[PDB]
Every structure is written in C-alpha cells, then in structure tokens.
Amino acid sequence: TIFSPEGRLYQVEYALESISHAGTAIGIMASDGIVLAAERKVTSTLLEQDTSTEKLYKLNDKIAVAVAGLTADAEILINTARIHAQNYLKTYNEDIPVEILVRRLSDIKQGYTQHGGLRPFGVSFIYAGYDDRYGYQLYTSNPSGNYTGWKAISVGANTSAAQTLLQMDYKDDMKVDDAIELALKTLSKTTDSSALTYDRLEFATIRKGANDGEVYQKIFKPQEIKDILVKTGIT
Amino acid sequence: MDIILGIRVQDSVILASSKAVTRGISVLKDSDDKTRQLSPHTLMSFAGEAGDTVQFAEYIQANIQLYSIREDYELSPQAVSSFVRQELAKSIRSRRPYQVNVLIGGYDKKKNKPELYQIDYLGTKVELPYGAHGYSGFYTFSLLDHHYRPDMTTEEGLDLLKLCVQELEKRMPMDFKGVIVKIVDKDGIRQVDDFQAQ
Amino acid sequence: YSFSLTTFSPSGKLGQIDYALTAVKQGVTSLGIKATNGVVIATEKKSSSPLAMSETLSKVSLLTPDIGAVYSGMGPDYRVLVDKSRKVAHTSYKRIYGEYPPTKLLVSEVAKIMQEATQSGGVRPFGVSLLIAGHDEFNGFSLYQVDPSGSYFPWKATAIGKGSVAAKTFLEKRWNDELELEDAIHIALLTLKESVEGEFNGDTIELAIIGDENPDLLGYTGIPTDKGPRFRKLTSQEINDRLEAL
Amino acid sequence: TTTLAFRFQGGIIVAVDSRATAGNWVASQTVKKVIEINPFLLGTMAGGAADCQFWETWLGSQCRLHELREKERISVAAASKILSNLVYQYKGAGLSMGTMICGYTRKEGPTIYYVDSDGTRLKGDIFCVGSGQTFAYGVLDSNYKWDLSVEDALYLGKRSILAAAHRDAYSGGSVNLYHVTEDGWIYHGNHDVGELFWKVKEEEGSFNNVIG
Amino acid sequence: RALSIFSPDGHIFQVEYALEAVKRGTCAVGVKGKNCVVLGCERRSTLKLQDTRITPSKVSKIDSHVVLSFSGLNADSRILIEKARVEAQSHRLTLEDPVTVEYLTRYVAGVQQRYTQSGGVRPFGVSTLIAGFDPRDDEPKLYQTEPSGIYSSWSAQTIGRNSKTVREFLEKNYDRKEPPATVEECVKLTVRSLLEVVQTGAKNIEITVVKPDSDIVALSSEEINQYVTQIEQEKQEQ
Amino acid sequence: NYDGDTVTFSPTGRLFQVEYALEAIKQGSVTVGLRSNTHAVLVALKRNADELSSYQKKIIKCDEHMGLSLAGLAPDARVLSNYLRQQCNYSSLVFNRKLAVERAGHLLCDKAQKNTQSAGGRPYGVGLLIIGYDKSGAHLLEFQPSGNVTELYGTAIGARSQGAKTYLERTLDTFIKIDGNPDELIKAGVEAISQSLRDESLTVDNLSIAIVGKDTPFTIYDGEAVAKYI
Amino acid sequence: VSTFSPEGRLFQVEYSLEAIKLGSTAIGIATKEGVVLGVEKRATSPLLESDSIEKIVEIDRHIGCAMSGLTADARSMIEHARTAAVTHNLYYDEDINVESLTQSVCDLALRFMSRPFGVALLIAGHDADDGYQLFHAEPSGTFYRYNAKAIGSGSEGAQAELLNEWHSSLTLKEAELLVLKILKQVMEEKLDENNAQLSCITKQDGFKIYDNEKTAELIKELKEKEAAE
Amino acid sequence: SDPSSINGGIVVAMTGKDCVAIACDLRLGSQSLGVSNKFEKIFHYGHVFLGITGLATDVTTLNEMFRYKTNLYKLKEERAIEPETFTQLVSSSLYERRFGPYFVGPVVAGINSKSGKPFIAGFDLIGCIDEAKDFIVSGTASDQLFGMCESLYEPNLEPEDLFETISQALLNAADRDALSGWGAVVYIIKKDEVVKRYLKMRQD
C-alpha cells in the first residue's frame, strides 16, 4: 500500500505478477452473446472434473465471471458481489446493471490499494453480462481496482500471445458460435500443455435465446465441452 | 389532512396537491407546493407530519439526483418507487419514523407508459390508475370508480380532477385553499397554472 | 500488529503460504479414496513414545454425521480448525435450514477460515492440508482437499504429506469408477503400507468411512425419516481383520 | 408573544412585542425578541425564551462562520435552513419555538422564512407568530397593500402589534420596530404600550371598546 | 501507522512519489475562453481491441454545471469523484444552491490533503482539473488540484505525461489580453496543444465543451477530426 | 540499535529515548527554585529567539498555592501543568482540600512513567520546578521526565544549571533562614541564577519571578515589577 | 514519528521546519498603529491566476494570519482558528484574545494525525488588554511573540533587515513600505502588485487585505523614496 | 391499531393427490377504505410457493427478503430450495426478529422435486411452525377458513376437484369477512405444471 520512488504500487505490481502464472481465461463478446473459456492450471487423472468449479462463477442470472489468480481470494470477492447484486435487486426491483456491479468490486480492490495495511487480493476477473442499457458487456478487473471493457480479452498466463491472436481473428460482426471457436483456438495455441483436452477446460456462454425474449446462462457440462471440441476440429 | 391526489390517464400522470399550510388556528400559507421533482420524468407529492414531510422529500430528491449523475441515466418510476418504499419501511421500525405519505407519478420512457404509485408511511406500496392520501380518498375513490376510463386524454384527466376537487370543496370540512396541478408525460413535468378558473 | 504477515514477493509468490505448504510436506501421510457407495479417509498414528495413548488422539474427526476430515502438517492447527468447522456447520447452516450443510459448502467455509489467516493482520497461515470426505442427498459422495491458501479441489483419490508423490502414483494405478467401498478400504490399506516405517497394525492406523446410514449409532428409535450417521471410524479390531487378509 | 414580518414595496417590516410570562406571572415587559444577526439579517423569537435565545444566538455564530469560509454573507434561504435543520435533529425532545428569519441579499431580494420547532420552514410575504398571532393577522391582513409607503408600513406593523398587545394576555410591554432595505436593517425605536395606546386611541379615534 | 512522514530535507516522499504517478498518467488539459472552458484528454496505448461504448471516458460530471478530469491512478480518481458528487448534492440540500466551482475544488483539495496526514493511508495518485460555471454567472472557471492538497485557478493548465511540453506551448500561445472569444478557437488552441504530445490520432484526442447554465457537450471522433485537419493544413501552408 | 522506542531496554539496562528526552532540558534556558520556611520562590531567566522576540514565559500558575517553572519543550510543560491544574481543581471541588505539593509530585511522576512504558508514545521532554505553600509549609520540587521527583531546599535546571546549584549548595544555611522576609528570598534567588549566566547582565525582560507563601498567593512578576531586583 | 534524537529534538518536528524553509516568504511587523502582514505569491507559472493565491487569511475581524510552507496543511488550522474565535464569542459575548487564539492553534498542532504540519503561521491581531500583537506558530506547538518576524525561504536575510529597520515608533505607513522593501530584496522575482500581497489589522477597521491597486501605489511610493540616496 | 387488521387479507393452502393448492384474496385496504384490488399475497421462489397475510408493508418486505435469500441459496447450493427447507428458513428468519416481529402469517406450499411428496406449512409471526398434512389457513378470516376447510376437505383430491374445494373454502370464508375479498387467485401445483386462476367474486 506504499508508493515506489517511480510512482508505482509495489504490492499491486507483485500481485499482477502472481496472476501472470495462473491458468488462462478468455472473454469474447459477439453480436448475439458472450463466450467465457478458461484453462485449469495443474491437473491429474484423479482430479474430479465432473462436480468441479474453479474458474467460472455465476454472480447473478445475467452476469458471470472468469477468474485468474488465487481461488480463495476470488471466492471472498464473488460472495460479496453476489450480495451487492441482491441488495440492488431488493432496493430497486431491477437486476443490477453490469457496470455498477463491476465498479463496486473494483472499488473494494482499490481499497486494499489505499488503506488498512492488508495485502491486495491476487485476482483478476473477466465479467460477462447482459443488461437492458448496453446489452452485452465484457469487463476486466485487476488488483489495482482498475476496470475496462472489451470486445475480446484474456487474463492470467500468456496474455501477450493470446491477445495478438484475438486481435488477428476477431471481427465486430461476429456470431457466438464463431466466438466459441475463436476462444478454443486461442487457448489451443497458448497452452503450456501437450494438447487441449476436455478435462482441462471450463466453458460458459450468455445468449439471448431466439425462442423467448430473455437471457440464458449456460455453464457447459464436461461432456458438452468434449463435444464442442470435436466440431471445431481439435478432437 | 392535506389533499394529495393522483390520476394516470393514457399518456400522462397528473398530480394535484392542496396549497394550504395550517398550524393550529391559522392558515399560514395559501400557496404551498407539496411536491419535489425527483428526475425530469418523475415527480413526488407528499403529506403528513409538519417537519418530516419536506425533510423526507428533499432527502429522496438528493438521493435520486445523485444516482442520476453517478450513472448519467434516469431510474425508472418503478425503480424510484421501490427505493422510496424501502426507505419508509426502514423508518417505520426506527426510533422516530417519518410520518409521511407519498404519491409518485412518472413517465417510463423505456416503456413509454405513465405510472402512478401510492405509498404510505409504513412503506405500503401499490400501483394504481388513481390514488389519494388521507380523508380525500374517502370522497374521490368512488368518484373515479364511476367516471374514470383507461384511455382518457390529458385534457379529459384534468376535467376528471376538476370534478374531484369540486366534490372536496363541497363536502370536506377544512379549507384547503385550492390545488396545484402538475403533468408528467413524455416531455417531462409542467405546471398547469389555469386551475383557479376553467 | 494490524498488518498482513503474508505479502507478495517481487516474483509474485506468497512466502508464508509456500512455507506452510513445506510444513504440510513434512507431515505424516494421509489419503482419501472415493468409492461408488463410499469414501474412505486414512492416516498413520505416529506415536511419539510407546507410553503415549494412541486412541486419545483424533487424527480422523467427525465434522457432521455425514462429513469427516483428516489432515497432514501441524496437529494443533488442525485441532482448532475442526472445532471452528463444527461450530460453523451450526451457526451458518443448521441453525438456519435445520439440516447439516452439504460437503462442498462446509468445505467452502473451512477454506474461508484458512484464507482469512492468509490475509488478516497479525497472523500466520494454518500449517495444514485437510482431506474432507462426505455425503449429502443432492451431490452424493465427495472428497476434497484444502490447502493453507484456502484453495480446495475435489478428488477421486489423493494423498498428502511426506510420501504423497509415491502414493498419488500408487492410487492412480488402482482407482476405477466402479469400486465398491470394501475395495477402496483395501486399496487404502495397501497405499498406507508403503509410507509407514515401523509397526503397521490397527493401533498405528486410523481409518474412517463415509458409507451407509448406521441406525444403531443414532442413539434413539422412533423417527424413521432420521436414519443416522454415515460417518464411521473403524475400530482397531476391524482394521486388523482386514490386514490378515492382505 | 406577538411577532410579525411582512414584505412590501419598500422592503420588509418587522415588529415584535416585549413580554415574557411564566404561567400567569408577567416575568418581564422589556425583553428583546429580535436578534440582529448581521447588518442585513434579523431573527424573531416566539415560544420558549431560552430555546429561541440560545439557538438564534448560535445561528449568528454559524452565519459568521459562513462569512469567513465563503467570503460572502449567508443567504436568508441558507441561514433559515441551518436553524431549521438543527431544530429538526431535536424533534420530539420538547423544544418550543416559532421564528422568522428576515433579510436582504442581492440574489434573493427581501426574503422572509418562517421556521418552527416542528421543523416547518416556509418562504412567504406575511407571517405572524405567537399567542397574539391572530390578533395581528386581523389588523394587518385588512390594511395590507403591496404599495404601502415606508411610513405607512411602519405604522401598520406597530399598530398590528398594538392590537395584539391589547387583546392577548400574553402579549404587551412595548413594540420594537425594524425596517429592512437594500442597505440592511434600520431600527425604528421602542414604543411603550403604556403611552402608545392612548396616543393611537386619541389620534386614530379607535379602541371604542375602551373606557374613557 | 504513519506512512506519509517528513524526510531530513523537509519532503514528504509519499506525496512526492504520488506526483510521479500523475506524471506517468495520460495527459489532460483545460483552457478557458471568454465565455467557455474546454477540457481535453489523450487516450492510452497498452492494448487496443476495447469497447468504447461502456469504458469510462476521462471527463466526469460532478454536478450539471461542473466537470472533473484527472491524470494519474484511474482507480484513485473514482473515489475522489464519488465524494465530490456526494458533496455536490449535500451542498444543494443544505444551502439551496449548487456548489461554486471554487467550493467543489476546495472540497476535493481538502480530501487529498487529508490523506497526506492520516495513519495507514497512502496519498492520492491523482491531480485534477475541475471546470465549470458558478450558478447564475457567466465568468468561466478552471482549477487544478494535486496530491498534496494545493489548489489554484488557471487561465489554462495541463497535467500528466509531457505536460512539461504542453505548458511551454500554452505559455506563449495563450494571450490573457485575448482569451479565445469563440467556443471554436478555444477548441482549436486545445487541439494544437494536445497535438504536440499525442503523435497524430482522432481516437487519441477527446474534447468536452462546458458553457454557462449546465450546457456541457462531448464531441465526436469526426467533430474533433475537423480541427485535426485545419491545424495540420495551416502548418503545412507555411 | 536500541534507541528506536521507549518500549526497549539496552543490554546495560538503560532506556535511551528517556535519556535523550532528558537532553532537551539541557538546551532549556536556566531556571532556579529555592525556599525558606515561610516562602518559596521561582526565578526563571527567559530565553529569546531573536532580539525582536518575546523572552518566552517559563512560569505557569497551577492553583492559588502552587505553581511551576519549565526547562525544555514548552508544549510538554503545558500538557503537564494542565494536568496539574485539573488535579488541584479536583482536590478542591471534591474534598474542599488544597492539594499537597508532595501529592502533586507523585501524580506527575506517575503521568511521566506511563509515557516511558508504552509503544507509540514518547517520554515528556521537559523538567519542572514546583513550588507551593500547603498545610506543611513551603515546598520545592524537581521533576525529571524520567518520572523522578525530588524535594529540595533549592535547585536549578536548564543550561549551565550547575553554577546556581553550586551557589545554592553553599548558601543553604543563609537562605533557609529568610523567614518573614520576602524580598530577601528573591534576592538570593537572583543572586543564584547569575552564577549560571555568561550571555549577559540579566535585564528587565530576561527575568521572571514567582512567589508563594504563608499569606501570599502564588503570583508571577514580570518586567517593571521585577526592576527592583536587578 | 515521536522519536527523540540524541540531541533531544524531535526528528519529525525538525524536518517539518526544513519544509517550512522551502516555502514562500511571509513578513509581519507590529506597530502601535496596527500590524502589517505581507507575503510572496510565488506563482509556479504565468498562466496561474495570482489572485487565487490565498496566503493571508481572515480568522476574525480582529485577527489575521499569513502562512509559509506546505500551505495545504493550513486549511485545518485556519478552520480550527475560526471555530475557536467564533465559539469564544458565542460562550463569552466578546472577542478572543490574540494570544488565546494562537495557543488554541498551537494546541491543535501538538496532536500527533500521522505527522506534524508542514507550515508555520504568523498570527497578527489586536485586543484591548495587550494591544497590537504578532505571533509565530511553529508545528512544534510552540509560539513566540515578535515585534517583527519573517518566515520561509528569505527569512534569515529578512530577519537581519528587520533587526535594522524596526523601532518602537514606526508609523503604519512606514511599516507597510518596510514590508514591501524587504520582500523586494528577498523575492526571486521583481516585486509587483501581482506577486506580492499586503494586509493589515487596525483597531478601528479590523483585518483588511489590500487590493492590487492599493498595493501598486505603495510599490511606486517605495521606489521613489529609495531613489533619493 | 392491531397491525394484523389494518390492511386485511387471507391465504389458504391444501394438499391433494400428487398436488398442492394455495389461494389468496386480492384486497388491500386501509381500515374501512378499500384501496387496491390487485394486491396478490402469494409469491414463488422456483417451485416453492409462499403466501403472506398481515401488515402489507411486512408482506412486501418479507417477499423481497425471501427472494434475496433463495437467490443466494441457489447460487451457493447450485439447486433450487425445497419446501421443507424453505420452511425452516422462514421459521428462523422470523424468530430472528423475536422482540420486534413482522406482523404476518406466512404459508408455504410446494412439491418436493425429489420425493414428489406434497408439502404445506404455516407459521405464527415469530416463526412457530404449524405442520399439517391437510390444510393451513391465515388472515383476518382465519376462523371462517378453519370452518370451511374442516367441513369441505377430504384426503386425495384430484387437482381439478381440489381446485373446487379450495375455491369454495376461500370464497365463502371471504364473504363473512369485512376486510377480505375484492378478488381471489388460486394456484394449482403439480410436479410438472402450475395453473393460476382468477376467481369471480363479490366486489363488496
């Protein structure tokens, strides 16, 4: 929580450094939806991938996050985010606008930046959400309390590599299925591992169902990831 | 009791509020505006205990104005009303509750529909085609039950109010010194100054 | 002393959590294996002297009638976490919903307590890793590992402490998704034989199962909707019976 | 007590009586019920003598503090609201006061606020406050014109207080007169009812209810 | 625990290092015309693939008549902006008048100052430009605050990376005798000054115009691009 | 490495922060105290920062029967004399009892002690001479920020205090007998304070005098009123 | 933060005083006809509007003060001083004594908030018992009365010139000129009405800050008086 | 001045064969004055239904509170709350305000998604649980409702028959109460679907 002679925040810099070793997560914003994909760092045959959750968390019915960093620090912040959403809904009888929830979380992080003598949370988030003001939105926050919005973005390990690729293949008039594909390809080329299997992945989409008028959050089952791997030719 | 009345026609909400302020044996003012603009499309009328009344309204006003600027966006009438309800429902169980009743009239631009909310000091909220606080409702509710129609024009709604006011000038014991009338539609909030002669 | 004793180093490591993991590394080995109708947790009762009474030490602890825990690293750190965990199962869950929490959520709460020791002022992280085995109506059987960071993960089978590396290996060869509980117990007994140096009998080995409901461990009859604890510690006599048929 | 303030062409007239009572006991006939806050600001007092005197003396302090902070005299709107907000904190604790804050500022012109311990705050052109209020309203409302000359407006205020001193048991003593213009307040003397009544009776030919 | 302390030379190093974070912050400028004030801010280059619809631009509304821009730590600025917005509403509520720009500046300056002398807090890595018009008044206003809590008004002023440079420009180009009597020639001077540091870009420069009686409009990429063209022409005409 | 805080002993059992606080006294302008059996006097040479400046006030009244002179940090004399005012006041209001000088001593010692034992705080950095007339006669006290207090017939503190402390150490049998004679005790005081001068001849602004006694309430003399003593 | 050096001074207090030496000059002169306070504006640039530089402030009608050092630190002292003067008037129906007001500000100063103030103050006023007065209030919590005093970067030089020029019958007009003079000498820039500011407090009229036009006339009168020898 | 009697209202719930029903009136009054005839007193959180009578402000507040809690519950537990469990949540949230209670009479109704076993329950204002297998009543016409149900009710009614029984109980109980009526809605609840019906009733 102190400044360097250069005007930088030691503990913050070092926290970003911590994150740079965490499994990669990618957010891609389409025209008709949003993709979240994330790579599980350190796996084993015995690790129970079925009843598992470590990188993709539901915040709300309209908002999900992807986590890079310390899992336990993340649960702390997810939990208070879930509560802030509910307070907003109780107060106003309207689901919380994505930006507002994101601003709140960033503010909490910024706090540890500026007072109390406690270590910052070693966590970066990608936020995928929908609201009636701006429709689909993608956000990112890191230990500095800073947040920004994106068409596509990545966090954790190998962001320079992954960033370049997304910049190369993303286009404004994309569709969700293409974004799913783009997400998988990008993780496919930045993995620190042999090849991309299903047990090393978490996957989620936010789509405005063509039959209805309401928004659906899907967190892909193990078998569903396995399938979406074959279609795009990674078998 | 002060008269606060509200009626929502097809394309607007109309608020009418008594102009008298009476302490004890004297009418101190005959031109009081018992209303605060919450946002350019949302208006609140209020009546109740002497000090509580304006302090509550100004407190709600400051909170709503602050939200507007933080988000550069106007909250929906529904949202504003849920905020007011919760505020009242908190106060009902505190050491000294606000003794204030309110009507919230707003035009929801996202839905293009006018909305009227009635809320008492306990935090009892309800959405209605017409509403009133205090003794007023005892005369006007039946009037409107009879003469009201969902698809009235703003001009029809004002003639309906004239009727409401007339009944209250005929049968109510206190001289409430006429009403101030205000319209909330797609274009915001204006004050009909022509009510003392029509 | 109101500042965090666990900070980030320039390499981005959190020193105290690493050192806590090292302490866990020196700990006696413990394991869990998930069967299709059960989970087993097991460890060695390292007697510091033969004068000490082995039974008087709970290395395997009941947290709720369907959730057990075992550990590696610092015994006293574990003992206070069991206490805080039992209490939180009540304050955060049973006193609210009138049922005991599901495994993942209790685990979640323990993880919370450990995370806090990673960040609050004036404290050091817990020097333990826990294996928490349990059952609940909606998720069935599960097994989770919790580390000094407050991180947790579900395993089909795993082992922690001293001889973990070799034991993870041995389990990997022996684990299939069709194991009966008695099979998982047997496998657990084998894995444990490799890590243990001296005597290897029922009085140096602690084992508990999360299995079927034990009506005769309930304390009362009358309410048939209540069937009793799934957690059961095996007796010294019951272990030896399964050792002779090695 | 009777206090009045009204607005007209030539600014603001402020008049008050000077009687303090405890039950039926007349405690004093020479009590100051106007506080001169700054050369452009006046406060009038009715209800509990202590409550008014204490809190309006304090009001002057908070007003001075504004002058130092913002390098500018406080507005009537803002001064009135300091008292109003204070008094609202105390609501229910039994404070008893009804006051008028009167003054001129360039942006506001002549302004009058009525503030009471209920927390009521009203802007207006004419107020009477206190146990004699209705006696003053009676005389004042039926002689009030916007275009009253300064000299006629001073008399009206004076006479309206006289009216209440006469009929209200809890009013009396003397009249204290103030005129508020662009240049600030001007004191227009202390007038003992003992003398004032007879003069006004003789000169105006009123008070025919009265013996000889 | 006292973090902002004095050193032997009589310097508060944390306050000093906070200034370094402002220096590292993207540039911001404000100039005040005869009947306007214009605020201009450069745009970063860490990555580009952003969504600009939702991402917070550099000029924040405090009340309907006052705006705030900053150079420095982005996260620190949100906190100062919130407190400023809360105070703005609070002043209306108790004084029945909106804040003067000077008052809102003194408030923000005070907050920054407070964080230079409290245990367990670090100063704000932020300097602000605060611009607008007092209620019912037409004389334009521009003020600067810094992490130490000092504040003052400026004919024109710049802060952030390469403000050193752009202050040089304005010092010879701004004539006190003749403030840019048009909204137009005010934006012109503001664009010229940013150009020296920005290295050509329409998606680089953003502009906001503030006029009396709560008249505040942001410009569009193209609207600015028109000034970009006429300035690069009149320099190439020589 | 052991002079960081007062909460720390050195290997030889010393408290350096206290010792350093004691040092601030030695930079204080000199002051003298002395008493017969019927009076007690404080003489305090005041120090000036510039020739245009005050010769800062070194004598503070504590009650009608008690007072003190300071050498060191003036703010600290203000904290402590204030506490002494309260303590003397409490004795009056609650017990209708004038506070014993000794009792003042014990109270100051205890206030100073706490500041030598807790982290975050710092020892007081001022020495005080305390005179009073109570129910057991005249009294002079010396307070050190270490929390040590001593009762003396006479003494001096501040820069070059040793001169006056030596003069008084010998003049003992001459002044202790100045009973019923006020002006002659002030004389002896002034005659003592000069044995520690060097700077100059003590002037009409240089000098500050305070007397308390049998039928004399504690009074401070400054300027024109002290002219007859130079 | 509350540590003693072996010399028995407070590290943080001594360093605070070093910060003050880096500040703009402030000079005060006390006469029998008033007390004058003057300051060096020191704009960090010609674009800065010099009239927005507030280094002489009113505390009450009878009390003004000039500052030098980290001037942002002085807001809370000025506020405390104003509150204290006003409160005293509320509780006692009179003007606070100048010394009492200074003592109250010095009391605030003692209250080691994470660090000492990085600003010294010249407090000038009048009162019936002790007449015209000048005080220097350091962040130590100590205060000193002076017939004349200077603080900030030009102080060592200025104090010597004040030693020469001061005598117990300086007229107010004489004293004003002296402030301008000594400021002209010690300022980096050439003294004019935009980078120096004069003020005084007289019993009859209270604390008044001189407007630029009135200061200019005094600068002109000063130049003319010196061009005689 | 009894907060239970200011606004008015009734809720009843009954079990049938592999189904449950919960019904309520629509009146919202202030004393004698009818104010709103569209004030529904039944809410749902997933497949769990909660009816609330009593002081209208507390009815609103309680629904909002239980929306909040069951939302968070769904997020953490990753499944919908069941009736048996929600009941315990209601109970403890009410008992938490033991010395400043919400003035309400809540009723729970739903089917257990695992057992298929139909479930109803009621509570007093401090969370005491009434667990009847047959019917639960609440509101200002509770006596009348008790009379109707004990008379009309039988075990194992088909959804279509249960609809008639519960409607007749409500409608006739309502009609002997000054403060209830002004409209009525009935929810028939089965494992698979839920039908909501608005009743035609006396508007006096």
Ligand SMILES: Cc1ccc(CNC(=O)[C@H](CCc2ccccc2)NC(=O)[C@H](CC(=O)NCC(C)(C)C)NC(=O)c2cc(C)on2)cc1
């Ligand atoms: C300055 C000034 C004086 C008088 C007034 C007019 N008020 C009044 O005259 C009220 C009327 C009664 C009342 C009391 C409390 C609440 C409501 C009404 N009387 C009062 O407050 C009188 C004032 C009084 O007697 N003052 C003594 C002198 C200053 C004259 C020496 N006090 C009390 O009634 C009173 C009694 C007790 C017990 O505590 N206060 C206004 C302003």
Ligand SMILES: [Mg+2]
């Ligand atoms: Mg009942």
Ligand SMILES: [Mg+2]
């Ligand atoms: Mg009925």
Ligand SMILES: [Mg+2]
């Ligand atoms: Mg009826």
